[PDB]
Tab-separated table of C-alpha atoms and ligand atoms in Angstrom:
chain	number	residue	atom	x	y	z
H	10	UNK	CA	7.995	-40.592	-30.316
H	11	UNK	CA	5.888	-37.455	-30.191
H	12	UNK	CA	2.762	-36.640	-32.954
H	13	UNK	CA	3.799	-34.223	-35.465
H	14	UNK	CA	1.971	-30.606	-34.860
H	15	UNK	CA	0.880	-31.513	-38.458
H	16	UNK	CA	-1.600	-33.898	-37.124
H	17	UNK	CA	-3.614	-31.348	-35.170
H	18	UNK	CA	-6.312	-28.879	-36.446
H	19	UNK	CA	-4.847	-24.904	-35.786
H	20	UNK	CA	-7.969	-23.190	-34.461
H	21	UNK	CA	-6.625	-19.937	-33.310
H	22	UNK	CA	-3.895	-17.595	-33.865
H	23	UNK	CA	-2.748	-14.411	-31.622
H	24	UNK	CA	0.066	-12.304	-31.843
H	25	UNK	CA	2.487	-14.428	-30.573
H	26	UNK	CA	0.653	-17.507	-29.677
H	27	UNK	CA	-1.063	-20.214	-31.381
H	28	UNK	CA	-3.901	-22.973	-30.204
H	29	UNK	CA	-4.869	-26.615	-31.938
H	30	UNK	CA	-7.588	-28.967	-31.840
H	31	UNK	CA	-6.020	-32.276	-30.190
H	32	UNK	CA	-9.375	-34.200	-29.521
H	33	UNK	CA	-12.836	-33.064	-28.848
H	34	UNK	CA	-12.267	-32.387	-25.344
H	35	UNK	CA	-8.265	-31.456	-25.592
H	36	UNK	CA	-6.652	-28.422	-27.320
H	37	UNK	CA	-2.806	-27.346	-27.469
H	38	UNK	CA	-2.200	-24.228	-25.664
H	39	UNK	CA	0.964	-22.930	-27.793
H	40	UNK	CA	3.786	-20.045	-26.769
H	41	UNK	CA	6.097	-18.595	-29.349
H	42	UNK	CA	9.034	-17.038	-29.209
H	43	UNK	CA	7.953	-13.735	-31.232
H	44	UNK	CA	7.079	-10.345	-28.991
H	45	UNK	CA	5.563	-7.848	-29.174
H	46	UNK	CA	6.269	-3.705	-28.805
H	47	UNK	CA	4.534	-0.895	-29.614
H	48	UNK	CA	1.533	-3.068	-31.072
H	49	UNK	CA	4.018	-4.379	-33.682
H	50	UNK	CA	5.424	-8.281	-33.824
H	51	UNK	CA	8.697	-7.891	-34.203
H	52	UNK	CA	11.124	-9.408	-36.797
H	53	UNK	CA	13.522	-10.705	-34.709
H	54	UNK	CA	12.317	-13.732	-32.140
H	55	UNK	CA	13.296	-13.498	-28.491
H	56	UNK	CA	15.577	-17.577	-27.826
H	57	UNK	CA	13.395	-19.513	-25.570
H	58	UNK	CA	10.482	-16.686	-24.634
H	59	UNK	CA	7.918	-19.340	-25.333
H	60	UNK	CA	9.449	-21.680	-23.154
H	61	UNK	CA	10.208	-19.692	-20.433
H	62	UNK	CA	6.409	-17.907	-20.545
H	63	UNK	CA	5.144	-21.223	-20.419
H	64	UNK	CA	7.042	-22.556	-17.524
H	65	UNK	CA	6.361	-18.747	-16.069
H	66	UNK	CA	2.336	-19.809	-16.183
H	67	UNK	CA	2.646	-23.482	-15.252
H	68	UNK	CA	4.417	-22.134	-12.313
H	69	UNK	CA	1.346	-19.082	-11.169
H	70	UNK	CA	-1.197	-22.254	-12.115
H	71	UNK	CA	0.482	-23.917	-8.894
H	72	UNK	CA	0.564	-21.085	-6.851
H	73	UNK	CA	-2.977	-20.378	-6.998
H	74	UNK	CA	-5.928	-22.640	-5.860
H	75	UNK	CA	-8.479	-21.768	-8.859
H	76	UNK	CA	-9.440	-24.514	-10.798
H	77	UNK	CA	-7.721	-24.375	-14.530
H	78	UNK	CA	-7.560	-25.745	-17.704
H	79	UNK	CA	-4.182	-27.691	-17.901
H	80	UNK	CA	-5.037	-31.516	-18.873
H	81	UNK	CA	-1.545	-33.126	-18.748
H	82	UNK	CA	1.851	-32.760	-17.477
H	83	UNK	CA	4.427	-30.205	-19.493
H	84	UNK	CA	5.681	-33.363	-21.105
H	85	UNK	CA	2.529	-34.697	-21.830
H	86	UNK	CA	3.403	-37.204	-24.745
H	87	UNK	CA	1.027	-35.556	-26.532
H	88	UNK	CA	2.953	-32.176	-27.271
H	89	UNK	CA	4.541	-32.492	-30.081
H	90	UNK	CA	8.781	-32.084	-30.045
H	91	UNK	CA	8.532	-29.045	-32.228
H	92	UNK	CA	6.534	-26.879	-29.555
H	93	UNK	CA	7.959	-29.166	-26.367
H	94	UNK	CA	8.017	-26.886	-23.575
H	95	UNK	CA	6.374	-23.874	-24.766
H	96	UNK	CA	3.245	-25.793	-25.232
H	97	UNK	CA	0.811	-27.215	-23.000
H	98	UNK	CA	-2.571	-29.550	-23.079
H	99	UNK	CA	-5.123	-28.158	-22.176
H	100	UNK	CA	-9.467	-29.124	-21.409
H	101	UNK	CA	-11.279	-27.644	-23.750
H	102	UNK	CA	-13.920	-25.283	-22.227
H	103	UNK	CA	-16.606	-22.766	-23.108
H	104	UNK	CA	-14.592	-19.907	-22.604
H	105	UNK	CA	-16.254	-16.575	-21.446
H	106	UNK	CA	-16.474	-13.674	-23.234
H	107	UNK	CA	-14.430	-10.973	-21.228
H	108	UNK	CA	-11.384	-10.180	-20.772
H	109	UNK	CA	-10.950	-10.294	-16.943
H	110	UNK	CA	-7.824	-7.340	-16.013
H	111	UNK	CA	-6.629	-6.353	-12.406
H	112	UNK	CA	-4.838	-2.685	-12.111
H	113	UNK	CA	-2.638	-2.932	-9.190
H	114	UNK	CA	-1.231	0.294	-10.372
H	115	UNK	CA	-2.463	3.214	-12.327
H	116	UNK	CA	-1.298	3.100	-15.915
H	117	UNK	CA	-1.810	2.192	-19.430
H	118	UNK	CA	-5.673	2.976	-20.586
H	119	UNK	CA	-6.324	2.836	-17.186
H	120	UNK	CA	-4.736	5.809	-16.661
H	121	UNK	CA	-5.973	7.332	-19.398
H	122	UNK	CA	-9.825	6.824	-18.877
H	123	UNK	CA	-8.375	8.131	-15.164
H	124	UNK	CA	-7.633	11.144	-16.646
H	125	UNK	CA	-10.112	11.480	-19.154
H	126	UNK	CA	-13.110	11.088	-16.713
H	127	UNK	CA	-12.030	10.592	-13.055
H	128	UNK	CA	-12.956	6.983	-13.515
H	129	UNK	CA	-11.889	3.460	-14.485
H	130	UNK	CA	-14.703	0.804	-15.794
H	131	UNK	CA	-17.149	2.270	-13.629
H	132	UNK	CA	-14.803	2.805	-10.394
H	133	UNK	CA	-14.912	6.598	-9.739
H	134	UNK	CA	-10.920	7.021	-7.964
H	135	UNK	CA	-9.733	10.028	-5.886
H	136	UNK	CA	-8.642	12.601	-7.034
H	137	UNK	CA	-4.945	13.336	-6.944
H	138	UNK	CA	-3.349	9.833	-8.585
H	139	UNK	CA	-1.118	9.305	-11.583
H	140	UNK	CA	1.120	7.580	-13.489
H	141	UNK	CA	2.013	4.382	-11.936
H	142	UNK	CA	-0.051	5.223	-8.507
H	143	UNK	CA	-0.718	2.341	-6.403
H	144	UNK	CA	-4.522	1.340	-6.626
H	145	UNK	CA	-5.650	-0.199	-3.195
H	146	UNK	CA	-7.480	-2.559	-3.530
H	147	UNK	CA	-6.919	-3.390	-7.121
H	148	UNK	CA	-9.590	-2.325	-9.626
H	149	UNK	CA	-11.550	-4.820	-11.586
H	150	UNK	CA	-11.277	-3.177	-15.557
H	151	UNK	CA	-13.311	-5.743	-17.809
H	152	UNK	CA	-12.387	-5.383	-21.393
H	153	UNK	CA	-13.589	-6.801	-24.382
H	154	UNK	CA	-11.784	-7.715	-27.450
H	155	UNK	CA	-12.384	-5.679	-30.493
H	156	UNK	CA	-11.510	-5.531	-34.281
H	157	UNK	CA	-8.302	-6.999	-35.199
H	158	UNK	CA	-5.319	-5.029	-34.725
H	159	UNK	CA	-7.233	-3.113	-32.420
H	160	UNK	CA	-7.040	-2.532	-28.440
H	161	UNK	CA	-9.497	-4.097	-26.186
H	162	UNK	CA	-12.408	-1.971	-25.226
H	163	UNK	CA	-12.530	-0.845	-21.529
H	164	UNK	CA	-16.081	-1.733	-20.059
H	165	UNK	CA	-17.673	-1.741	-16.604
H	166	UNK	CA	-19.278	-4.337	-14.723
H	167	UNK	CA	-22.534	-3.534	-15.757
H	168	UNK	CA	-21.221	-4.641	-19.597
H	169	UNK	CA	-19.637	-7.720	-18.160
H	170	UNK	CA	-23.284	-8.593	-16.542
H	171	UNK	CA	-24.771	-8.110	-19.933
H	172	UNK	CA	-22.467	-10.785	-21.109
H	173	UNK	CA	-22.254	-13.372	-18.721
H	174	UNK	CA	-24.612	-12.747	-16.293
H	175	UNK	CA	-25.379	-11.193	-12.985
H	176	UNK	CA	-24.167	-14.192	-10.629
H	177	UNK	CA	-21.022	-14.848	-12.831
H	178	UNK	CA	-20.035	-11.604	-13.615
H	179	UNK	CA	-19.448	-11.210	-9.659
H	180	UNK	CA	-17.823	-14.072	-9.791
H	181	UNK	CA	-15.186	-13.090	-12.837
H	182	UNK	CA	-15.199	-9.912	-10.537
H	183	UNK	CA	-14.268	-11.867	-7.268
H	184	UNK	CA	-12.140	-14.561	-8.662
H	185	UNK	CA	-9.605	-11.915	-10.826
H	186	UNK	CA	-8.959	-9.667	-8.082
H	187	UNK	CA	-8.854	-13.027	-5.362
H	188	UNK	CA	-6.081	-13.981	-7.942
H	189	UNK	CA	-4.179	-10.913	-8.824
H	190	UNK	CA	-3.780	-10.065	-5.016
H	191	UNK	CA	-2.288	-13.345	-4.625
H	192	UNK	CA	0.228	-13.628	-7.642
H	193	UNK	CA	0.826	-9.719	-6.738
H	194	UNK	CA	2.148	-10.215	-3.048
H	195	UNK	CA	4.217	-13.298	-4.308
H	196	UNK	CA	5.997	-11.526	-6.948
H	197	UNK	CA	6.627	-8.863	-5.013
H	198	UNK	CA	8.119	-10.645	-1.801
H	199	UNK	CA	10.670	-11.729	-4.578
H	200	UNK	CA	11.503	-8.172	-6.190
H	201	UNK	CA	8.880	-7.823	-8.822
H	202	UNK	CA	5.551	-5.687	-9.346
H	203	UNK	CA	3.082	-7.362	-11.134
H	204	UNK	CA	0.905	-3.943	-11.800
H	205	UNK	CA	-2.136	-5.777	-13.968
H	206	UNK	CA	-2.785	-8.568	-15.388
H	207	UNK	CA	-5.139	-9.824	-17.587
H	208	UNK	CA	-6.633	-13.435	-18.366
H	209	UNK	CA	-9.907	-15.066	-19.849
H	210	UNK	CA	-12.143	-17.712	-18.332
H	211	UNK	CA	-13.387	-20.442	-19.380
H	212	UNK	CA	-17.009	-22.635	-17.888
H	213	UNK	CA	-16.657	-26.784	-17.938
H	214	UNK	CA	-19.636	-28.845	-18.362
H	215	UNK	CA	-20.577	-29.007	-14.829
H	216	UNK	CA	-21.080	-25.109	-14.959
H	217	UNK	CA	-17.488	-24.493	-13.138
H	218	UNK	CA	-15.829	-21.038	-13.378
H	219	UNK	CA	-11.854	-22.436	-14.747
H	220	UNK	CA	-9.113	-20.456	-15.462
H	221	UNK	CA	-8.219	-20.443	-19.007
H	222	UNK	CA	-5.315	-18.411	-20.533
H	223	UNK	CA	-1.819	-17.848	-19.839
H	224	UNK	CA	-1.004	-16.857	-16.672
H	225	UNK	CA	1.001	-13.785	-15.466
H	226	UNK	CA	3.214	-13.949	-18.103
H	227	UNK	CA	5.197	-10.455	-19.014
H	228	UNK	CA	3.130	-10.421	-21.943
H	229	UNK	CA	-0.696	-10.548	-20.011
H	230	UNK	CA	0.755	-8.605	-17.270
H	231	UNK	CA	3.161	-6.057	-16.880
H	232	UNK	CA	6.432	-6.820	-15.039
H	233	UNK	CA	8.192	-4.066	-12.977
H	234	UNK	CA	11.262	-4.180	-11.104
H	235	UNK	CA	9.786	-3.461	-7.495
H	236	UNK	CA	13.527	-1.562	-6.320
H	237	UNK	CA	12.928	0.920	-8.744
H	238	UNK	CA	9.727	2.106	-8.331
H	239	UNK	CA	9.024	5.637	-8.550
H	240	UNK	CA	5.331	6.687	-8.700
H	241	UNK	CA	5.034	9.533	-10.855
H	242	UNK	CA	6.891	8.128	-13.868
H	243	UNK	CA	6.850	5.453	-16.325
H	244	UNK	CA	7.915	2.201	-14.804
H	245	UNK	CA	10.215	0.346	-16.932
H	246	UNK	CA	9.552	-2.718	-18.498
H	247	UNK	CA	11.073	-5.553	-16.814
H	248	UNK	CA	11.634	-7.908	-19.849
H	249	UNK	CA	10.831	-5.157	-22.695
H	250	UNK	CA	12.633	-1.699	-21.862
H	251	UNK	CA	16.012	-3.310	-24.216
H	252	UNK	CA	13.522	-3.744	-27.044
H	253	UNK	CA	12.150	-0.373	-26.718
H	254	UNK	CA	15.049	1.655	-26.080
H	255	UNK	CA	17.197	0.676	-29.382
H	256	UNK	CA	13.539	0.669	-31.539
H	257	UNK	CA	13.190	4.197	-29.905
H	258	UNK	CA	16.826	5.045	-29.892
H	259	UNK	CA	19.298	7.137	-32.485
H	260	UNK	CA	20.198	3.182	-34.102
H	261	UNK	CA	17.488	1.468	-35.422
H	262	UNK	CA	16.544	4.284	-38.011
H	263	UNK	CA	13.252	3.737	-37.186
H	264	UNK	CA	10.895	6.675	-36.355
H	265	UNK	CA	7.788	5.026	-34.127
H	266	UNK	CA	4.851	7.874	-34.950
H	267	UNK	CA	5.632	6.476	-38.510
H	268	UNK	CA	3.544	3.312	-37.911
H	269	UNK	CA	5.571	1.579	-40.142
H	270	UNK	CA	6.555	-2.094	-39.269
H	271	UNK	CA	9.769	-1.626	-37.320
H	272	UNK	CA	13.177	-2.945	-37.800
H	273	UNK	CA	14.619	-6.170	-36.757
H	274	UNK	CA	16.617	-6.460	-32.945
H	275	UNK	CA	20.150	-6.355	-32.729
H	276	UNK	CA	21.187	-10.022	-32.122
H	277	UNK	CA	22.649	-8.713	-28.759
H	278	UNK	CA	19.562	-7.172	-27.616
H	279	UNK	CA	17.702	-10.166	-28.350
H	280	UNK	CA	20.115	-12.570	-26.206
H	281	UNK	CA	19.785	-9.301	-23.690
H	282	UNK	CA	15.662	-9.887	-23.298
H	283	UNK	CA	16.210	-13.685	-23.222
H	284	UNK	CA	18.265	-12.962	-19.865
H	285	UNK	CA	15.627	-10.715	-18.514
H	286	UNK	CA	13.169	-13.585	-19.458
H	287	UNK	CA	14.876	-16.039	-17.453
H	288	UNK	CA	15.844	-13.509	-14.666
H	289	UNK	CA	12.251	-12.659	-13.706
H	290	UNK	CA	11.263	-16.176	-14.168
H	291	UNK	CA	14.013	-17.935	-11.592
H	292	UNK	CA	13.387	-14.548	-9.476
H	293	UNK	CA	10.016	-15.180	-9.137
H	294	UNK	CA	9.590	-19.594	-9.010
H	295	UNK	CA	12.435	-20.095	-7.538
H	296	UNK	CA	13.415	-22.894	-9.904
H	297	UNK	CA	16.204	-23.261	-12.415
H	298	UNK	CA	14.665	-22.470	-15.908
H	299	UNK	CA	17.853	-25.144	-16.790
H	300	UNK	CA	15.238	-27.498	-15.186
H	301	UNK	CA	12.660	-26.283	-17.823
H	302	UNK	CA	12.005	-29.089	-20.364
H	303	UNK	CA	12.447	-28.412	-23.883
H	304	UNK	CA	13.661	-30.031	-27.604
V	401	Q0Z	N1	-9.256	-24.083	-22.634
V	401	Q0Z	C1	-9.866	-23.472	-23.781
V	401	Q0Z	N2	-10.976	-24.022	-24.297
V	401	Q0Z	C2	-11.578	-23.481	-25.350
V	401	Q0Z	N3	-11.075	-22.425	-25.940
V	401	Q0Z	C3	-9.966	-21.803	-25.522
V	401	Q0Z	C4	-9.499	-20.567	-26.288
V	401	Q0Z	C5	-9.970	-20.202	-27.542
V	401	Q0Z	N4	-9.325	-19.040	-27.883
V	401	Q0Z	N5	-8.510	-18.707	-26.864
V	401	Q0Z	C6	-7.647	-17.541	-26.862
V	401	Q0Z	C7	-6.312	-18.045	-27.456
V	401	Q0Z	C8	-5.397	-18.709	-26.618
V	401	Q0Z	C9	-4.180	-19.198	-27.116
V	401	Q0Z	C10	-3.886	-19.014	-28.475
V	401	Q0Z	C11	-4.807	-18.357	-29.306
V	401	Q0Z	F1	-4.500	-18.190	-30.584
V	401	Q0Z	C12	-6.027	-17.866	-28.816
V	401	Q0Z	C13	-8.596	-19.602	-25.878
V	401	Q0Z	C14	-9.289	-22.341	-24.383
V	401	Q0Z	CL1	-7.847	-21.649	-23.705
């Protein structure tokens, strides 16, 4: 016997996750199965994403030494059935109004403000890089979320002292690029880039800096398969290149500088991304997502 989700308060929706009010120190950290391309949620849900996302950041949580926010095991018998396994409880905190990003590699806005300016957040870069250049050491790019619907704003550090102050915004600083390096190395010693990554943080009542978000998930980070990378180019997307080839392609009859809500997945290319999922996921834990719990 599990509680219903119906008996908890939703509090916060993203694109494809959700949160709940489970007491007034406990909320339910909740991953769906919908993605995400080309800033659109897609029709069609991607079988087991949420679960396998989750079990992706439970996993990076126990890699790394940071404190964090998870409150309970995975099958916590607080989690309702509905969400078991794609859902996890979690302390709530006073969470910290930056988005905390590592660049690895040069792409994305990154790139752009890179190109743009010569600079990244503040970090002035030689001169000579491109798409998908390797960044060493990894940039700190603070962001901070905007309208809805709308990308996150690139700031420097400056702007992240302005919000959270001097000693802490070192810290955020410190502590992101302490934990990209880390998750970075270990993906890659398996076969896959993690080229940024991008989390929030959250401060317990004792003042503690705690890690609050999901973890280096293909959705807060992008995946790359590390035997094909080619600096110079785009790097595909390890778990989304399917989706974005057929909404791209000459069968979805869907024309993408049309901003018009695109078309649902072929069934195959959903099972397809599902694989890719679970591929990266074994690849990089070394578990058996069979092993994952789940309804
Ligand atoms: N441990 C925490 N304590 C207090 N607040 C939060 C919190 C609030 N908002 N968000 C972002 C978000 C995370 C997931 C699903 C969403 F819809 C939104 C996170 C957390 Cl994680």
């Amino acid at each position: 016997m599990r509680p219903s989700l119906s008996d908890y308060q939703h509090v916060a929706s993203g694109k494809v996750r959700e949160l709940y009010r489970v007491d007034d120190e406990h909320l339910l950290f909740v991953a769906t199965d919908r993605i995400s391309a080309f800033d659109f949620v897609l029709d069609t849900p991607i079988p087991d994403k949420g679960r396998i996302l989750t079990a992706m950041s439970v996993f990076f949580f126990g890699l790394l030494t940071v404190p964090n926010h998870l409150a309970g095991p995975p099958d916590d018998p607080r989690i309702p059935e509905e969400v078991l396994g794609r859902a996890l409880l979690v302390r709530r905190l006073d969470m910290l109004p930056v988005e905390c990003v590592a660049r690895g590699y040069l792409t994305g806005s990154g790139l752009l403000d890179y190109q743009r300016t010569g600079a990244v957040c503040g970090h002035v870069l030689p001169q000579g890089l491109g798409e998908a250049s390797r960044l060493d050491p990894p940039l700190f790019t603070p962001a901070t979320k905007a309208d809805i619907g709308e990308h996150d704003m690139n700031v420097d550090f400056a702007a992240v002292v302005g919000l959270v102050g001097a000693v802490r915004a070192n810290q955020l600083r410190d502590e992101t690029i302490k934990i990209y390096t880390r998750a970075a190395a270990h993906a890659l010693h398996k076969g896959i880039i993690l080229a940024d990554t991008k989390f929030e943080f959250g401060v317990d009542i004792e003042g503690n800096l705690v890690l609050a978000d999901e973890v280096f998930t293909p959705d807060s980070s992008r995946y790359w398969d590390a035997a094909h990378y080619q600096p110079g180019v785009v790097q595909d997307s390890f778990d989304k290149q399917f989706v974005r080839n057929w909404l791209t392609g000459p069968e979805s009859g869907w024309d993408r500088a049309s901003d018009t809500p695109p078309p649902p997945l072929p069934d195959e290319v959903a099972v397809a991304t599902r694989e890719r999922y679970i591929e990266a996921y074994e690849r990089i834990s070394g578990l058996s997502f069979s092993d994952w719990i789940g309804p």
